[PDB]
């Protein structure tokens, strides 16, 4: 518990990167989180929306 500042900074950066990667896999109200499946299942208008 002596190098707390550097460890905290590194942990914050790693947490931000991990949060971004996880948020990449969010639906955001869409049918699916992967675009290939959305293109396969839906017609061009609904898939585009």
């Amino acid at each position: 518990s002596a190098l707390g500042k550097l460890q905290d900074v590194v942990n914050q950066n790693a947490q931000a990167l991990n949060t971004l990667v996880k948020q990449l896999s969010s639906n955001f109200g869409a049918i699916s989180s992967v675009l290939n499946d959305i293109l396969s299942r839906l017609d061009p208008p609904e898939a585009e929306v």
Partner: protein, 49 residues
Amino acid sequence: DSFVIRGDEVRQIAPGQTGKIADYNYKLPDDFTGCVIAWNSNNLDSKVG
């Protein structure tokens, strides 16, 4: 573009609308601007027999 179709084919004549006849005969683009004027011709395009 002037043509003659059946009753239910009117719906298929639309931008972004799926359909066998629309995909095989005449399809509107996704970014289509403009429109369709459809009128009944039961007294002109229909003959007995």
